[PDB]
């Protein structure tokens, strides 16, 4: 398995699909996205890598994207899927029962609280209950088949609140808020906790990391990252968290940091081939040859 980073932003949106091998340290250059996109999210269902939402920021135009695209590491090929009902820049996504939930994001000046669900067997999207809050730059994680939306920006205020979606009741309920306001944080699940790393509170990019324990319904800080960063990519690979790129108020970072929960330590493991923010990141099998 490899860590795939798709799209991103550096002076314009990007079409890179690159895969990192934590063992031998290589970055593999794979098939470009059909359309350059930043602020997208990545996920894996089956073994297929999906790139969801985002925005094409190009010298010739600036369009938010509703697109859903699917990458097969067996063929090194992208294929389009049916699009979401609306464009969603700075989206969050999560996977439950082989279905992709697309959460929040923006379209122009519209800040979504809508959520919709993709069924790959039918190549079909369907709207579900909207969140209690409009959230762009929202982090999303799935724990115990429940979907969590964490932080973000409602168009006026950045958020430390978090809410939880129950699919069997089709409803959202607020949970304990994070200690820190974060939009554009990296949010993932590791072991049995939700981690929220970095982000932007409207004043500073953050290096703090905190984790939600569902059993105690409390957020606790862990060791901070070495580099403050907002709009970072994040994923889990072999029991460790990897954060990729992001923006620190001055630079689009290429730093990749890795969190070992056994030692509560972050270390810098690699650099991306070029700094960028707003990537989509996920883990799946190595490509053919």
């Amino acid at each position: 398995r490899l860590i795939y980073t798709a799209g991103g932003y550096f002076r314009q949106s990007l079409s890179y699909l690159e895969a990192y091998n934590p063992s031998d340290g290589t970055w593999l250059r794979l098939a470009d996205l059909q359309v350059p996109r930043s602020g997208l999210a990545g996920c894996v269902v089956g073994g297929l890598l999906y790139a969801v939402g985002g925005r094409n920021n190009s010298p010739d135009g600036n369009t938010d994207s509703s697109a859903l695209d699917c990458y097969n590491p067996m063929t090194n090929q992208w294929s389009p899927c049916a699009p979401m009902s609306v464009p969603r820049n700075r989206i969050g996504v999560g996977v439950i029962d082989g279905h992709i939930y697309a959460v929040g994001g923006s379209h122009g000046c519209i800040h979504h609280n809508s959520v919709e669900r993709y069924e790959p067997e039918r190549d079909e999207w369907h709207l579900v209950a909207p969140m209690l809050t409009r959230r762009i730059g929202v982090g999303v994680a799935v724990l115990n088949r429940l979907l969590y939306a964490v932080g973000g920006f409602d168009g006026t205020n950045r958020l430390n609140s978090a809410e939880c979606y129950y699919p069997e009741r089709n409803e959202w309920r607020m949970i304990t808020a994070m200690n820190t306001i974060r939009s554009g944080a990296g949010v993932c699940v590791l072991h049995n906790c939700i981690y929220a790393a970095g982000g932007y509170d409207g004043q500073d990019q953050l290096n703090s990391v905190e984790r939600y324990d569902v059993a105690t319904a409390t957020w606790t800080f862990v060791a901070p990252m070495k580099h403050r960063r907002s709009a970072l990519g994040i994923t889990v690979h072999q029991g460790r968290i990897y954060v990729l790129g992001g923006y620190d108020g001055h630079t689009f970072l290429d730093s990749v940091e890795c969190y070992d929960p056994d030692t509560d330590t972050w270390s810098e493991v690699t650099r991306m081939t070029s700094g960028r923010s707003g990537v989509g990141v996920a883990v799946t099998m190595e490509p053919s040859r």
Side-chain angles (χ1 to χ4, degrees), residues 260-278:
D260 183 1
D262 288 348
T263 52
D264 185 41
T265 57
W266 289 92
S267 42
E268 220 162 4
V269 287
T270 192
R271 285 191 195 283
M272 291 180 298
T273 58
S274 65
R276 63 196 84 151
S277 66

Side-chain angles (χ1 to χ4, degrees), residues 6-190:
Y9 183 89
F10 175 59
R11 306 205 171 141
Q12 72 186 54
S13 310
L14 308 171
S15 320
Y16 304 136
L17 177 68
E18 291 170 306
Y20 173 64
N21 179 329
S23 293
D24 70 11
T26 60
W27 281 100
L28 230 45
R29 178 78 182 276
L30 296 176
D32 277 357
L33 288 156
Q34 175 65 26
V35 184
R37 297 145 71 178
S38 57
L40 74 165
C43 55
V44 167
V45 189
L48 299 176
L49 174 65
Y50 290 87
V52 198
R55 146 187 285 251
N56 181 4
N57 268 340
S58 269
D60 314 305
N62 295 293
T63 302
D64 298 316
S65 160
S66 66
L68 174 69
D69 297 279
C70 186
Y71 173 82
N72 190 344
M74 297 286 93
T75 64
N76 190 32
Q77 296 186 349
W78 288 97
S79 324
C81 309
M84 312 178 277
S85 64
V86 295
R88 296 176 186 275
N89 182 31
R90 303 182 56 100
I91 189 180
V93 305
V95 177
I96 304 188
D97 290 333
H99 297 178
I100 303 179
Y101 287 80
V103 178
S106 52
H107 175 209
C109 271
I110 296 177
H111 298 73
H112 299 307
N113 54 22
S114 57
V115 180
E116 56 193 291
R117 180 190 82 241
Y118 178 67
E119 286 163 348
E121 309 276 330
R122 295 182 79 151
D123 185 48
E124 260 174 35
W125 284 95
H126 297 281
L127 277 163
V128 300
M131 289 181 291
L132 301 168
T133 320
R134 310 176 170 282
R135 302 178 187 266
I136 87 165
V138 55
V140 171
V142 176
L143 181 49
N144 308 333
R145 281 152 148 179
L146 294 192
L147 185 84
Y148 295 81
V150 181
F153 175 60
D154 69 12
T156 307
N157 307 103
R158 303 192 161 75
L159 313 165
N160 60 345
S161 65
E163 42 189 300
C164 169
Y165 175 72
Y166 295 71
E168 72 274 33
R169 326 208 297 232
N170 187 34
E171 63 173 38
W172 290 89
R173 312 272 287 123
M174 202 73 75
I175 63 157
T176 310
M178 294 180 296
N179 297 286
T180 303
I181 286 175
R182 305 172 191 275
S183 77
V187 163
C188 65
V189 162
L190 177 51

Side-chain angles (χ1 to χ4, degrees), residues 156-240:
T156 307
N157 307 103
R158 303 192 161 75
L159 313 165
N160 60 345
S161 65
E163 42 189 300
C164 169
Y165 175 72
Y166 295 71
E168 72 274 33
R169 326 208 297 232
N170 187 34
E171 63 173 38
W172 290 89
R173 312 272 287 123
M174 202 73 75
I175 63 157
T176 310
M178 294 180 296
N179 297 286
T180 303
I181 286 175
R182 305 172 191 275
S183 77
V187 163
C188 65
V189 162
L190 177 51
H191 298 317
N192 257 45
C193 314
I194 302 183
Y195 288 72
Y200 179 53
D201 64 17
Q203 290 270 50
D204 314 298
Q205 299 78 33
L206 313 163
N207 53 28
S208 71
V209 184
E210 49 188 309
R211 69 160 174 240
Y212 185 76
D213 178 56
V214 51
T216 58
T218 70
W219 296 86
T220 302
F221 285 109
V222 295
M225 293 171 303
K226 181 161 320 144
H227 296 139
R228 320 183 153 259
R229 50 182 89 214
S230 192
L232 55 146
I234 195 167
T235 193
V236 170
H237 175 102
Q238 298 173 177
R240 294 176 165 103

